Amino acid sequence: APSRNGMILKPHFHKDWQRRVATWFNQPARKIRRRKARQARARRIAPRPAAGPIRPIVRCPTVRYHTKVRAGRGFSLEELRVAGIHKKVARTIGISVDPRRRNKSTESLQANVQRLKEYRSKLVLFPRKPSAPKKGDSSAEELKLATQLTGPVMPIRN
Amino acid sequence: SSHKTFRIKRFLAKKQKQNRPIPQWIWMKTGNKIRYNSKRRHWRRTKLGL
Amino acid sequence: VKWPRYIRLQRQRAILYKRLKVPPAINQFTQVLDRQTATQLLKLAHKYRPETK
Amino acid sequence: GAYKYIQELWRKKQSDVMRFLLRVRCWQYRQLSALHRAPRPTRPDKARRLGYKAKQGYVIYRIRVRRGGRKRPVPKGATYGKPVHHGVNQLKFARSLQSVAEERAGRHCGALRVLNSYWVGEDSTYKFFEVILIDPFHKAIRRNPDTQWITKPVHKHREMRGLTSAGRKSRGLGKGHKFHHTIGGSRRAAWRRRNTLQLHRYR
Amino acid sequence: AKIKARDLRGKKKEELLKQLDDLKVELSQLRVAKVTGGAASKLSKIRVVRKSIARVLTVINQTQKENLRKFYKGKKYKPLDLRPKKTRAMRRRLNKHEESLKTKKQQRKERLYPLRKYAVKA
Amino acid sequence: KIRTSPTFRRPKTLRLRRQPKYPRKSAPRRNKLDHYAIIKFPLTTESAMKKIEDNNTLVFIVDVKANKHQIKQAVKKLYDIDVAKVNTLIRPDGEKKAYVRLAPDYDALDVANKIGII
Amino acid sequence: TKGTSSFGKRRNKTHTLCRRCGSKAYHLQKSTCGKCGYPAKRKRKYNWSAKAKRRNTTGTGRMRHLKIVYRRFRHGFREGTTPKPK
RNA sequence: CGCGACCUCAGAUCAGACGUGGCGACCCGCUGAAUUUAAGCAUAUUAGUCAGCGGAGGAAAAGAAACUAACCAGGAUUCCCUCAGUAACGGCGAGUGAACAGGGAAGAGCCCAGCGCCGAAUCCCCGCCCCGCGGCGGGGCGCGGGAAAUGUGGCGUACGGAAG
Ligand SMILES: [Mg+2]
Ligand SMILES: [Mg+2]
Ligand SMILES: [Mg+2]
Ligand SMILES: [Mg+2]
Ligand SMILES: [Mg+2]
Numbered sequence: 001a002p003s004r005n006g007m008i009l010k011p012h013f014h015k016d017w018q019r020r021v022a023t024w025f026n027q028p029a030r031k032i033r034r035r036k037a038r039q040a041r042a043r044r045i046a047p048r049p050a051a052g053p054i055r056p057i058v059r060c061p062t063v064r065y066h067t068k069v070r071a072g073r074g075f076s077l078e079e080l081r082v083a084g085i086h087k088k089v090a091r092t093i094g095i096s097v098d099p100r101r102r103n104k105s106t107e108s109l110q111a112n113v114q115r116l117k118e119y120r121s122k123l124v125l126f127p128r129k130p131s132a133p134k135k136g137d138s139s140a141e142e143l144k145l146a147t148q149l150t151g152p153v154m155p156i157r158n
Numbered sequence: 159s160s161h162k163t164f165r166i167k168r169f170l171a172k173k174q175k176q177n178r179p180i181p182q183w184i185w186m187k188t189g190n191k192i193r194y195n196s197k198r199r200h201w202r203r204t205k206l207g208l
Numbered sequence: 209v210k211w212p213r214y215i216r217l218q219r220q221r222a223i224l225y226k227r228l229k230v231p232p233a234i235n236q237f238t239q240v241l242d243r244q245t246a247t248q249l250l251k252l253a254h255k256y257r258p259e260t261k
Numbered sequence: 262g263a264y265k266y267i268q269e270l271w272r273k274k275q276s277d278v279m280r281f282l283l284r285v286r287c288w289q290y291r292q293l294s295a296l297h298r299a300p301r302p303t304r305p306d307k308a309r310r311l312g313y314k315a316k317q318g319y320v321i322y323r324i325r326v327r328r329g330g331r332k333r334p335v336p337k338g339a340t341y342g343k344p345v346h347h348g349v350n351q352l353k354f355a356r357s358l359q360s361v362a363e364e365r366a367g368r369h370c371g372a373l374r375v376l377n378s379y380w381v382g383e384d385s386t387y388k389f390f391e392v393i394l395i396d397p398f399h400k401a402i403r404r405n406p407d408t409q410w411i412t413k414p415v416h417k418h419r420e421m422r423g424l425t426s427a428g429r430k431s432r433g434l435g436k437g438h439k440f441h442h443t444i445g446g447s448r449r450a451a452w453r454r455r456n457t458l459q460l461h462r463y464r
Numbered sequence: 465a466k467i468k469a470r471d472l473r474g475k476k477k478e479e480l481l482k483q484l485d486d487l488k489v490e491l492s493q494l495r496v497a498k499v500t501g502g503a504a505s506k507l508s509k510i511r512v513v514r515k516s517i518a519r520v521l522t523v524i525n526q527t528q529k530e531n532l533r534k535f536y537k538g539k540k541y542k543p544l545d546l547r548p549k550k551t552r553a554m555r556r557r558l559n560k561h562e563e564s565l566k567t568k569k570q571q572r573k574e575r576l577y578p579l580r581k582y583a584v585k586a
Numbered sequence: 587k588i589r590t591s592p593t594f595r596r597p598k599t600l601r602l603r604r605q606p607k608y609p610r611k612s613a614p615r616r617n618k619l620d621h622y623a624i625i626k627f628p629l630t631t632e633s634a635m636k637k638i639e640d641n642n643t644l645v646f647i648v649d650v651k652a653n654k655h656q657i658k659q660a661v662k663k664l665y666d667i668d669v670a671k672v673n674t675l676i677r678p679d680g681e682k683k684a685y686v687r688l689a690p691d692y693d694a695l696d697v698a699n700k701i702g703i704i
Numbered sequence: 705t706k707g708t709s710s711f712g713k714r715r716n717k718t719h720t721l722c723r724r725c726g727s728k729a730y731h732l733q734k735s736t737c738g739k740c741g742y743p744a745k746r747k748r749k750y751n752w753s754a755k756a757k758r759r760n761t762t763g764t765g766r767m768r769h770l771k772i773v774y775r776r777f778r779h780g781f782r783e784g785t786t787p788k789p790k
Numbered sequence: 791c792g793c794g795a796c797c798u799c800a801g802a803u804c805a806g807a808c809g810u811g812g813c814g815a816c817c818c819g820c821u822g823a824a825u826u827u828a829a830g831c832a833u834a835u836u837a838g839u840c841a842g843c844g845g846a847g848g849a850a851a852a853g854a855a856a857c858u859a860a861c862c863a864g865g866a867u868u869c870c871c872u873c874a875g876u877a878a879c880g881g882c883g884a885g886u887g888a889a890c891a892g893g894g895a896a897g898a899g900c901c902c903a904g905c906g907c908c909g910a911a912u913c914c915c916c917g918c919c920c921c922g923c924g925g926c927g928g929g930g931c932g933c934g935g936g937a938a939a940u941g942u943g944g945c946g947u948a949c950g951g952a953a954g
């Protein structure tokens with residue numbers, strides 16, 4: 001029995017909805033649990049970047065968003081083989097790889113290769129055994145000046 | 159029934175010993191609430207199941 | 209004799225390979241070289257048996 | 262290798278060679294009982310594709326499921342209710358006969374664990390299937406690090422949660438635009454995520 | 465007098481049974497004294513003798529199995545009593561050896577490509 | 587071999603006896619129904635003492651898992667006296683009553699003075 | 705006749721006390737129980753009566769083993785050791 | 791006729807292990823109504839809901855594209871905000887109704903069969919010795935027994951791979 005004037009409307013409450021209701025009273029409990037887990041992970045990987053590995057410049061698809069630039073899944077292996085980083089060693093030293101991504105372009109590939117080289121210039125690789133250094137390795141006086149950075153490694157500006 | 163089986167006579171033997179009242183020193187205890195045996199059973203009134 | 213079911217099953221399978229029109233790709237395994245040739249083949253092949261444990 | 266030849270051989274099922282073999286095996290398997298142990302696979306290539314390795318502990322059963330649809334198990338007609346639900350005999354079951362064949366042997370051997378299963382023969386009134394099983398407490402698999410995943414207690418009765426290759430295919434499960442109604446874990450997890458109110462604290 | 469579990473452990477196997485049946489006899493005589501009408505000095509002692517029976521039988525049943533699981537410990541097949549009775553799922557979890565052992569392809573992968581300790585600059 | 591009978595039956599095969607590589611239990615279970623905990627106490631009612639005097643017998647309460655042979659061997663081990671016969675019933679409270687009729691050269695009143703009932 | 709008169713003819717009992725659930729529902733002619741379903745291996749249990757389940761779920765009786773495993777859990781099922789003597 | 795292999799198939803109180811049943815709030819597979827709404831009612835709706843059955847774990851399931859897209863392209867799964875009460879479905883009536891994209895939480899990838907190449911290079915069990923043994927394991931010796939060529943292990947799997 002609708003009254004004089006107003007929207008005629010379709011509330012989706014014809015099902016039994018009170019049995020399936022999600023109350024969010026553990027919202028601050030999860031916002032404490034996540035940051036406790038995050039502090040524990042950031043202590044556990046002790047000099048390593050707290051956000052995780054490095055993730056590439058990508059364009060969005062789908063006409064509404066292609067002007068913008070996101071962080072992607074991982075560095076494409078075509079973008080790795082011309083940066084000189086091996087596809088297995090990248091994930092060890094902290095470079096996210098996905099093999100699924102193609103490279104339609106050349107500008108994006110050169111930007112990601114420049115990004116990988118600018119990253120590889122900045123990592124401080126500790127020796128795999130602390131007493132004896134090796135060739136693919138950083139100097140001893142640079143080891144004391146390492147620290148975890150916060151936020152994403154080389155944050156993507158548009 | 160004077161032809162009882164052993165488990166039925168076993169059952170009746172326990173339900174007979176449970177019909178004994180409280181011992182009268184129980185209501186001399188400190189933290190006691192029990193005035194009398196309340197789960198008593200008279201053989202006319204309640205017919206025990208079985 | 210009322211034989212058990214596995215004996216009757218295998219004997220009736222052996223009879224069905226006689227009844228049914230067997231294709232030549234399976235008929236070709238019936239023709240085996242005779243026992244004067246098989247002993248020659250096995251006396252040659254006994255020379256080159258692989259080593260055991 | 263011989264497995265490519267016998268794979269392409271078993272692909273030509275309409276041929277006279279494999280037609281003779283299928284009808285002889287179907288006669289034999291129809292004469293024999295409902296759920297018995299085969300000593301070795303009839304399809305040695307297909308068993309190796311699905312996961313079987315000829316080592317101590319993998320056990321192959323061939324079982325027959327009785328072929329046909331599923332009429333509604335109801336007294337005489339008499340499915341009480343509206344004329345939508347008056348269907349009795351042209352109803353079809355949600356899972357497949359191969360999945361039923363997996364779970365019948367998986368229930369008959371509760372100690373063992375159903376790995377996968379395949380097709381051996383058929384006639385008008387039965388399907389036959391060789392379901393291959395793994396004995397999860399044998400030391401030839403509990404000391405093998407790439408098949409000791411099935412010895413873990415998570416994978417008890419894969420055939421009855423529907424986690425095998427032929428039990429999976431009735432869950433509507435997959436990536437795509439064709440499988441929107443199962444994103445989440447299942448078509449029940451999809452339904453449950455969709456038909457709730459996320460009543461937040463603030464709103 | 466007051467029998468306790470310390471000094472019973474040094475006694476040998478027949479001496480403990482020779483004390484056991486003596487305590488059995490004393491418990492039976494105290495039951496007869498309970499029925500005929502006896503003093504509270506004995507109807508209190510009727511608990512002491514039962515717990516004395518228990519204190520002796522505990523020492524027999526402990527020393528018997530302390531001998532048995534030292535007899536059976538070098539062997540691969542122990543009886544089900546001597547086997548460790550934790551929960552049923554963890555008596556059939558994979559053990560510390562066969563959970564630890566890795567396939568050699570994964571040994572080559574974690575040999576050639578170990579996770580490195582590193583840090584990046586700001 | 588000639589098949590005389592037109593039926594086939596299962597041929598009798600060999601089968602070995604249990605030779606286990608470890609016993610299931612570690613040690614045999616202790617006999618909890620022994621000659622002390624099989625006899626709880628003797629009665630001291632007037633219907634039991636009148637039974638003791640003339641009939642030359644003893645009246646005991648035993649637990650309900652005991653045979654008459656077990657009560658006979660138990661009384662002969664405990665009080666080292668021969669037993670003529672044993673009559674058992676189960677009382678309505680649920681525990682077994684035994685009537686140990688003694689040998690005629692053994693009086694019940696003297697062995698009652700021995701065991702403590704008067 | 706169907707009432708007070710016909711209530712006299714009842715002497716032969718239908719049920720008896722079962723030997724698994726202990727309740728008096730063991731139907732003598734069917735030889736099966738009404739509350740637990742005795743000769744079936746699985747317990748008779750339906751959740752159209754939560755009030756029939758919570759009469760005997762796990763929290764009802766002795767828990768004479770699960771009580772002990774609830775306090776052996778809180779040391780990680782430490783077994784075979786004894787505490788250090790005096 | 792016998793003796794011996796193999797193949798199918800029995801028998802055991804044979805040696806050693808494994809499954810059964812319960813709780814079932816959360817999870818998985820199936821079966822699955824009617825009240826109710828449509829101011830009647832039959833399609834729809836309630837609803838893949840209640841009840842029924844099977845199976846678990848500390849989480850389960852899912853999961854590393856036979857994907858989304860149509861862009862200057864993104865890139866396993868799951869969850870949240872949103873798309874959206876939208877596209878759509880529906881006696882187009884009542885009602886029903888997702889996804890892609892974007893922002894976040896988290897983030898991890900991998901392994902066989904096949905094609906091949908290495909003298910089965912592989913695995914299980916029992917016997918003896920040394921160590922440890924209340925998660926039965928490490929080594930040595932067995933002209934000791936089996937499995938396996940009707941294919942075990944090593945390399946190798948779509949990101950290619952092998953050999954020289
Ligand atoms: Mg109005
Ligand atoms: Mg009356
Ligand atoms: Mg309808
Ligand atoms: Mg899975
Ligand atoms: Mg399909």
Ligand SMILES: [Mg+2]
Binds near residue numbers: 718733
């Ligand atoms: Mg009747």
Ligand SMILES: [Mg+2]
Binds near residue numbers: 746747748749
């Ligand atoms: Mg049940």
Ligand SMILES: [Mg+2]
Binds near residue numbers: 804
């Ligand atoms: Mg045995």
Ligand SMILES: [Mg+2]
């Ligand atoms: Mg169960």
Ligand SMILES: [Mg+2]
Binds near residue numbers: 828
């Ligand atoms: Mg209506």
Ligand SMILES: [Mg+2]
Binds near residue numbers: 829
């Ligand atoms: Mg109305």
Ligand SMILES: [Mg+2]
């Ligand atoms: Mg109406």
Ligand SMILES: [Mg+2]
Binds near residue numbers: 837838
């Ligand atoms: Mg529906």
Ligand SMILES: [Mg+2]
């Ligand atoms: Mg339900």
Ligand SMILES: [Mg+2]
């Ligand atoms: Mg559990």
Ligand SMILES: [Mg+2]
Binds near residue numbers: 415
């Ligand atoms: Mg899982």
Ligand SMILES: [Mg+2]
């Ligand atoms: Mg892929």
Ligand SMILES: [Mg+2]
């Ligand atoms: Mg997505």
Ligand SMILES: [Mg+2]
Binds near residue numbers: 881883
């Ligand atoms: Mg209309």
Ligand SMILES: [Mg+2]
Binds near residue numbers: 886
């Ligand atoms: Mg709907």
Ligand SMILES: [Mg+2]
């Ligand atoms: Mg999205």
